[PDB]
Amino acid sequence: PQNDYIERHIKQHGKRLDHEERKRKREARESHKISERAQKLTGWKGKQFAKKRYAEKVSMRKKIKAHEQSKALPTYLLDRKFSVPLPKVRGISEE
């Protein structure tokens, strides 16, 4: 306690012996486990997984797009029957 004590602890002793290898291996196995979760996770969890993956794909597409792209009427007439926006609506029964 008292301040960023674990940051001090990591500076003084340091994280573990088996920390960097394991992190590398987790990052490597994540490619397998992503597909493993796709072919598994029946139901709502699989649906949400697919939603997340689609959103993540769109985000990276837009990021790459932004990278590669960052590499007659007048002003006043621009921005421009007496029928209401809803004639012929569904008919309601008295019942």
Partner 1 sequence: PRSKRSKLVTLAQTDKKGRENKERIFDEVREALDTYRYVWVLHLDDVRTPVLQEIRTSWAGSKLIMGKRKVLQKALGEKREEEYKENLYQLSKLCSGVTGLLFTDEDVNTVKEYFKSYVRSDYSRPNTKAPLTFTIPEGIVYSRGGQIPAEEDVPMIHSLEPTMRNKFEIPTKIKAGKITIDSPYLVCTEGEKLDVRQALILKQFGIAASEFKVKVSAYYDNDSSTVESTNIN
Partner 2 sequence: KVKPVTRSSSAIAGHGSTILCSAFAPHTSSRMVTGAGDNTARIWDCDTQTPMHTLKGHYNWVLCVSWSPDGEVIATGSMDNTIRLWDPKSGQCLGDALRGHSKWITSLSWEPIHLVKPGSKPRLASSSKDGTIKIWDTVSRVCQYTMSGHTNSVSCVKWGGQGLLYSGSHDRTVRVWDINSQGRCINILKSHAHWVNHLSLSTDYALRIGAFDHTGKKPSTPEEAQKKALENYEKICKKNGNSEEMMVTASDDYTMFLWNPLKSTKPIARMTGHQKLVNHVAFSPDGRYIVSASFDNSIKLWDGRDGKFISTFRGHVASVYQVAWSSDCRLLVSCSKDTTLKVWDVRTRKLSVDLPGHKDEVYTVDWSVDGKRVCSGGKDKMVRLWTH
Partner 3 sequence: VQPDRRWFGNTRVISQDALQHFRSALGETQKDTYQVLLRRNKLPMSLLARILDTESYADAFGPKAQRKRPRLAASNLEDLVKATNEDITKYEEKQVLDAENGWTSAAKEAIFSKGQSK
- Summarize as ranges the residues that interact with partner 2 (CB under 8 A): 72-79
Of residues 52-81, those binding partner 3 (CB under 8 A): 81
Q: Which of 52, 56, 19, 20 is nearest to 38 (CA)?
A: 52
Chain length of the chain: 95
Task: Quote the CA–CA distance of 37 and 67 in Å, as a whole number.
Answer: 31
Q: Does 92 bind partner 3 (CB under 8 A)?
A: no
Which listed range, 11-19, 37-45, 46-54, 79-87, lies at the site for partner 1 (CB under 8 A)? 11-19
In the bound state with partner 3, the residue whose beta carbon lies nearer, of 5 and 44, is 5
